[PDB]
Design a protein around this ligand. Sequence first.
Ligand SMILES: [Zn+2]
Ligand SMILES: [Zn+2]
Lengths: 267, 256
Amino acid sequence: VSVNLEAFSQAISAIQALRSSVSRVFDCLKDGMRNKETLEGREKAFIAHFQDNLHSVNRDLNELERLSNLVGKLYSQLLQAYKWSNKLQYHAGLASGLLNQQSLKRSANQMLVLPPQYVDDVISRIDRMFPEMSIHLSRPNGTSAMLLVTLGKVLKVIVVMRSLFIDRTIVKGYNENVYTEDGKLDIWSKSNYQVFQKVTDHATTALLHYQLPQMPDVVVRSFMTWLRSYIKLFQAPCQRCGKFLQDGLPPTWRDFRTLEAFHDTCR
Amino acid sequence: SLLRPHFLNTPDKSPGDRLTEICTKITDVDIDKVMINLKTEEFVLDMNTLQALQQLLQWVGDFVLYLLASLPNLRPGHSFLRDGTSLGMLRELMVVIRIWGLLKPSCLPVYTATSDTQDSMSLLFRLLTKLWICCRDEGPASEPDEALVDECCLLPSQLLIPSLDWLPASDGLVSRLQPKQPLRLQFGRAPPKIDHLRRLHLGACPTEECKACTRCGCVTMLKSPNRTTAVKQWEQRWIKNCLCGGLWWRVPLSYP
Ligand SMILES: [Zn+2]
Ligand SMILES: [Zn+2]
């Protein structure tokens, strides 16, 4: 497992540090006291350097002992290709991140139509991960798919798509009846509580925020990733004021790209 | 000069001359056989100055070892390999070092030996006698035989040849000058640190202040380190001059 890899590389650097620090002790003692103007000042400098070197040796030995407490347990062509594959994969990950952070594309111009089967395959692929979210697709009105995403015992989100691109979302509480009299989805309602109206507003900013132009799978996957973080409503405190309640509201803002809780008044 | 004979046996020869006669007639390769015939109750000191002589005896042993290891190869020792008189002097000092080591073992030079069943002083004395018998011949100029060459090739294996400081650290102008070209100097601009006379290793940046000789360039620290244990027979020779003759001249501290 990877923790053994990290502990072994850690303890490798611990041995190298121990050896170099012992040699540094004996090298600084080889040179002897320097001059340093004031006699009192030169004595102080020599004593301080020797003490620091000894302390560093002790720290390195202690760290090696701590890793010891925590440690657990033609053919060359294949390994060369394996190493070069991992190298290319990591290199490409870094270069792709650096380049798509800073794109120079200004306009798409130079000089939506999808089978519903594809939408069902995509959304079932999202439903297979996140075992606490269940997504139930239905199409009461044409090709525009409507999704009920239940989330723990916490949320019921009604997502109204339009050609495999999220359009509207409505977040209601668990007990709340999301069905009309006839058992269809109540696409147009609100949720009787202050908290879930705030989370509808935050979800509309979430669907306005996660916008790739072309590829919509990253959009729906990232929206569900962000939505999954709301399972710690009523349990997470705000990361600005520490408390749970500002004006009788839990922290309704799970921040994009770092899913942390905030009261929206604490931005 | 230091050995004061406690009683005069075989008079009309001072113990320097008795030692030189005995070391020049006894050509034995062992150090014990030379040391036996030398009246060794005469070679006695008070075991205080005898201990304080440690650094000069260290230079003697280190120079002998450097010279013998330098034999297989123009270097800082090339003249001494063929001078019979200086090798005789080095023999005599090794014999009196052996006697003084038997009186007190702390006066001896130290050699980092790559073996523990070794008598390093006797090894160097064996090689020194075998080199010196080459040159103590009358009208000789005997080139050294191959047995000595391979034995002195084995010396870096058996002991570690340390390093040595060679005195004329040349900053004199006369080597630097040329006819028809004058040096244009500024005042005060001036276009492994040892004390060369008492063989003490100063640090990287030395804390105690120093004199420098104005001709050779040797450095000594200004006041003696231990005023109680000081071999004043050696320190009081160089009060007014260096050994080369030039004057002392106080050097300023670095303060880096
Ligand atoms: Zn807050
Ligand atoms: Zn001089």
